[PDB]
């Protein structure tokens, strides 16, 4: 089990909860903020 | 004891017989040897360790942000607040080189810019010039000195024609003081000779004097010093502010060799926005 299935399915969504704390600037418009973190792939 | 301390000192890649005395740590004088390497700058006197005790660290590059880069030499920026110690010893690297200015007061309130050779492994310093924070007495630069291994290929000059660029990259004029110069007496004169003739070839004339300070940031109190360092650049203002001329131009035809010591005016900002009102 440690060789077959774990290696991506536990890694498919960890990279996409950034999109609730890139919104930490609101609480300038900068909605499409692609400065630092959106292009790390 | 204003003479050089001991009989042989290497500075990284080459030995330098130093010029003057520095406030070096005194207790290393009874053994006959002092040596010092490039990027740690922590002082020793015997090669018994840094033959492989520079496996203390893998520092290849100083923490100055390399703010220009070219085909041949780069340079960077140190402030005295984000670092406290190796910013300090670079002066004591060369207080044995510099003739007058030494430390009693701590060297923190000065920004510190240092010129540097590209290298195959880690890029090595050649010069240093020291801008203060804002408006000491004008005086846009301070102590400027090049490492004595590496002069006469013309690299000691292009950093005193970087120095005037960060004055109208902040949009106020500036110029050095007197303090003393017989060691480089004609050197800043050489650039202040050709800082004007290389950019008096375009004017569509009837041009005044003070806009030169607005365009080359070389001030009003020394344009006339350079208008008399070389030939007659007057006999026209007689009821108003000074006027400048041109002549037979045996200068720009000699401006094809000894011209390429330039900079590409294309890189980053240099404003310190904070105040840090210093008192001690």
């Amino acid at each position: 089990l440690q060789d077959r299935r774990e290696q991506e399915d536990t890694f498919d969504n960890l990279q996409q909860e950034i999109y609730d704390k890139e919104t930490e600037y609101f609480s300038f418009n900068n909605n499409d903020r692609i400065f630092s973190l959106s292009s790390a792939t | 004891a204003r003479v050089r301390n001991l009989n042989r000192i290497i500075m990284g890649k080459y030995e330098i017989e130093p010029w003057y005395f520095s406030p070096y740590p005194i207790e290393l004088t009874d053994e006959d040897f002092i040596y010092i390497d490039d990027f740690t700058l922590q002082y020793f006197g015997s090669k018994k360790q840094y033959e492989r005790y520079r496996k203390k660290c893998t520092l290849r590059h100083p923490p100055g942000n390399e703010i220009y880069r070219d085909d041949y030499v780069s340079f960077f920026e140190i402030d005295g607040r984000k670092q406290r110690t190796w910013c300090r010893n670079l002066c004591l690297l060369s207080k044995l080189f510099l003739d007058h200015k030494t430390l009693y007061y701590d060297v923190d309130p000065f920004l510190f810019y240092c010129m540097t050779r590209r290298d195959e492994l880690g890029h090595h310093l050649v010069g240093y010039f020291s801008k203060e924070k804002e408006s000491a007495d004008g005086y846009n630069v301070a102590c400027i000195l090049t490492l004595p291994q590496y002069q006469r290929m013309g690299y000691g000059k292009l950093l005193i024609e970087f120095s005037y660029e960060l004055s109208k990259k902040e949009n106020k004029v500036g110029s050095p003081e007197k303090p003393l110069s017989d060691l480089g007496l004609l050197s800043y004169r050489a650039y202040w000779s050709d800082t004007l003739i290389t950019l008096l070839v375009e004017h569509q004339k009837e041009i005044t004097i003070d806009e030169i300070s607005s365009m080359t940031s070389m001030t009003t109190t020394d344009i006339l010093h350079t208008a008399k360092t070389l030939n007659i650049l007057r006999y026209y203002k007689g009821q108003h502010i000074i006027f400048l001329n041109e002549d037979i131009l045996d200068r720009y035809n000699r401006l094809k060799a000894k011209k390429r010591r330039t900079i590409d005016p294309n890189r980053l900002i240099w404003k310190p926005p904070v105040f840090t009102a210093s008192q001690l």
């Binding site: 400065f35 630092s36 973190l37 292009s39 790390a40 792939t41 | 607040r81 984000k82 904070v274 840090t276």
Partner: protein, 76 residues
């Protein structure tokens, strides 16, 4: 005094540091070029990745000792 002079000085040692979220990506954005096409230099991606917060952790020495100096006055 304990609020006043101790206010802002934890930002100019971070005035060099907006650079952490601008040090990092274009050399991870240049080593993705190394895996888009056997594990020779593929080890060293993490050893510059783990240095992300490492000085911010050294700032976390300071940016939680300054919070730990909330009680230096009787009000805060």
């Amino acid at each position: 005094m304990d609020p006043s002079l101790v206010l802002e000085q934890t930002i100019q040692d971070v005035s060099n540091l907006p650079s952490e979220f601008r040090y990092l990506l274009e050399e991870i954005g240049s080593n993705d070029l190394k895996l888009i096409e056997c594990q020779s230099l593929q080890r060293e991606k993490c050893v510059l990745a783990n240095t992300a917060l490492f000085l911010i952790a050294r700032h976390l020495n300071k940016l939680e000792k300054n919070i730990a100096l909330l009680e230096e006055d009787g009000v805060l």
